[PDB]
Amino acid sequence: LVKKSTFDPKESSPLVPIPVAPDATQTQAAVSIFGDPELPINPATGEPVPAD
Amino acid sequence: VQLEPNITLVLKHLASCGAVVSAEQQAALDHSIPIKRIEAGLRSLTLWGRLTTLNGKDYLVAEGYNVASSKEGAAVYETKYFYSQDGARWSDLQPVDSETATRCARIKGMLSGDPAKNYELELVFQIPELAVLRCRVDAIATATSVIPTDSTILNAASQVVPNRLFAGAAYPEKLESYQHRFSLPGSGVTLSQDLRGTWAVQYDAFKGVAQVRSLLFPGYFFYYAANELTWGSLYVGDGLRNNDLIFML
Amino acid sequence: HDTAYLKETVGEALARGCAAAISAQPNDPVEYLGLWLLKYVKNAEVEGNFYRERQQDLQKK
Amino acid sequence: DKVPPPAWSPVFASASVTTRNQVAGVRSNRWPGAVCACAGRHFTSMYVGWG
Amino acid sequence: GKNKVYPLELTLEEIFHGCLKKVAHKRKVLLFSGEYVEEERQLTVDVKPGLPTGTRFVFEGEGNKTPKKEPGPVVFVLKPKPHPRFVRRGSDLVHKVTLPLHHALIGTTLDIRTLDDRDLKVPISDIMRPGSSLTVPGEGMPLPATPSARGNLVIEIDLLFPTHLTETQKMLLRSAFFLPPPTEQNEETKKALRDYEAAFKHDLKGWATVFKR
Amino acid sequence: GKNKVYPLELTLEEIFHGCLKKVAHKRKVLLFSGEYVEEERQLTVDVKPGLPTGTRFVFEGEGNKTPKKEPGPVVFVLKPKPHPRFVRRGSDLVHKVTLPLHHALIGTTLDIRTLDDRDLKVPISDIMRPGSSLTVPGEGMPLPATPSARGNLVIEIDLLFPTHLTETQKMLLRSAFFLPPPTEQNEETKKALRDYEAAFKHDLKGWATVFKR
């Protein structure tokens, strides 16, 4: 009952919240070896970028 | 006593039932499950199953919930579903409105590979294949999603949370020991309250591993090890339903 | 007269709210007081509802 | 669909098509659970599942 | 009778989450001296999540005070700063994406970064028409009435067609746009398609996988 | 000072060529009788080639005749009847053709029958963008000022994307949309392309040309 009855004036915090998340560069690099990386497109001309 | 089912123990205990994944896809899963779990802000994300297509490119499907609350006598989980042709990159499965959710249950046969396929039904209605896949996953989750009883408890503010003091289920052979996920902890609803012959349980007393297979949906398996309290489930195979249950049994 | 109307109408609840505002020291005590009164009536009604639900569950068991 | 599904859908072992030593086989649609695989000169058939 | 209006600029993240802004006001008390006297007043404005554009916050009692007439209220009108990705419409969000042609036809995933710190990857469900839109439910701005519901994000698809195509590329496109249905193909057609696919996905001499340069 | 305004509906062919219309007017003269008496006058209106829509022809001295006031003029306002093909936009026509996607990419020739009794075949000169257009100079309505020059016909293109595509068709489309430049192709690539082209254009078992059932 007390838990249900406690007042909780949720007010607008001055700051936008920030995420607490570990860095993900190493795992992303590890993932980047699976599958084929599709050739990126050139925004100027929809034809794909030169490749080897 | 566990808080989330492992992806390795599930694949190990369900390997015999044919619920297996390719080794390359298994490594890709091991790498890219946390990436999607952090990219989506989900506290829980596990592999839900694997659906077969007319190509070799099966759909791997993973579900994840952020909040899970009691609502009108139903333990509602706010699940999000993701699909992937390969274990590397995941896409989202948007929910389906009721009109197409009823026009998608009449489309049968095992799906194709490209998720950009339009089925045409009867004037002609065009329905995307992703909608059909979402319908099938929803139907299987409604019919099958199974956890041991008393493994969840209700706290203040009416949220279902894992029971940290779950000591395990006596008589794992009995179907009474298992319940659907969306059953409230207080209610005594189990798989016994389903149809009589739609669930087969085979329990190895020595190794202490019970195995529950769905006969209404033949490709759903759920293992529960009791020596160390570990339960998991996987659906492998096409998502179609077994209508004529009376004749088979 | 008017003082009695105010007292036996709102006095106890307003005193409780003012005590809460003194204890909490918010940045805008008047809005705090208004939200406190709204939550006051809401928590009374949901308190009654909570007792009703517990009784129903016990009877069902 | 108005196109009847064919039996024996393919099955691959890698997402990339440029892997070096990969196995690749067929899987039956009439009988779900029967699979044939072949790596070089080592081939095999096997059926697991409901009958 | 006269009120001083002032634009209040916010970012979409603040309106999505709900800011508590502090604003400075220059109030001019007018007296017998030729120069007026100015003072800086601080005002706290509480913008709640999902307040619609054009919202007016009126502070009564503040404003330039002439000797005889009590100053009229000051008005703050909400307006959002331009965002690099989203433009808000009504209650939901519009994201305009330039999409290549093959991403439309074959189908790919659009990767968008929400106002909240989540990364959506939305698949292309079918052949996206010119001027078509893809709607993701429960991803727009929150509803001001209820602080839990959300609008539906709208992705307006803009197609980016290729600038050049060779005659052999056009031949391949023509053959792809008139292939007989699979229950009407010859055996020669099936063998030819098998050969072409095995020669297009060749691990060393095939061009399915190319590394950029 | 009241006037009677009447629509005058013309077809695009008449305005293009220059019609000569005879219109009927029911004019009322007020008398001592309780009811009026009316008569039908005939009016010759001469529309010149390509007069702008909204042109007013005013006949002075024609209109209902009250006992005291000389009747005011009667106004005819020129408006065009809907056309199955063209809609005029100022001095030039607009034709809205729905185009298949492969006609857009590969390129075909649109067929248009002009207002004059001449047919017209206009090639698609490049990859037609979504919401793009084409212009054929000297194929619009005549200029009202000079009776020789005309506007320019404007084709507004609305692509008709295919409704269904198979997975092998998508494979062919991806191979077409990522083919390496012809100076980067291996010999295996060229041999495979030659084989596929010889198989797709096979005179008896190829699907390059089929007859509709």
Explain what the structure shows.
- The structure is cut from a larger assembly and holds one copy of chain A (52 residues), one copy of chain B (249 residues), one copy of chain C (61 residues), one copy of chain D (51 residues) and two copies of chain E (213 residues).
- With 52 residues, chain A is mostly helical.
- Chain A has helices at 2-5, 25-31.
- Chain A is elongated.
- Chain B is of the alpha+beta class and 249 residues long.
- Chain B contains five helices and 14 strands.
- The two termini of chain B are 36 Å apart.
- Chain C has 61 residues and is mostly helical.
- Chain C is 90% helix and 0% strand.
- Chain C has helices at 2-24, 29-60.
- In chain C, helix 1 (2-24) packs across helix 2.
- Chain C is flat and about 50 Å long.
- Chain D has no helices and four strands.
- A four-stranded antiparallel β-sheet of chain D has the order 1-2-3-4, with no helix packed on it.
- The chains are: A mainly alpha (52), B alpha+beta (249), C mainly alpha (61), D mainly beta (51), E alpha+beta (213).
- It is classed as structural protein.
- Keywords: complex, mechanoregulation.
- The entry is titled "Radial spoke 1 isolated from Chlamydomonas reinhardtii".
- Chain A: Flagellar radial spoke protein 4.
- Organism of A: Chlamydomonas reinhardtii.
Number of strands of chain E: 11
What gap, in angstroms, lies between the N and C termini of chain C? 53 Å
Tally the helices of chain E. Answer: 4
Subunit arrangement of the protein: part of a larger assembly
The two chains with the largest interface, and their residue counts, are:
E-F, 50 and 50 residues
Which structural class should the secondary elements of chain C be placed in?
mainly alpha
Cα shape of chain E: rod-shaped
> What sequence of helices (H) and strands (E) makes up the elements of chain E?
EHEEEEEEHEEEEHH
Strands across the major sheet of chain E, in which order?
6-7-11-10
Find the count of extended strands of chain C (DSSP E, 2+ residues). 0
Q: State the helicity of chain E in percent bands.
A: 10-25%
Biggest β-sheet description of chain E: 4 strands, mixed
Helix content of chain C: over 70%
Main sheet record of chain C = none
Shape of chain C: flat
What is the radius of gyration of chain C computed over CA atoms, rounded to a whole number of angstroms? 16 Å
* N- and C-termini, Cα separation of chain E: 68 Å
Question: What is the beta-strand fraction of chain C?
Answer: under 5%
Radius of gyration from the alpha-carbon trace of chain E, in angstroms: 29 Å
Q: Specify the number of helices of chain C.
A: 2
Succession of helices and strands of chain C:
HH
PDB class: structural protein
Keywords: cilia, native, complex, mechanoregulation, structural protein
Entry title: Radial spoke 1 isolated from Chlamydomonas reinhardtii
Chain A: Flagellar radial spoke protein 4
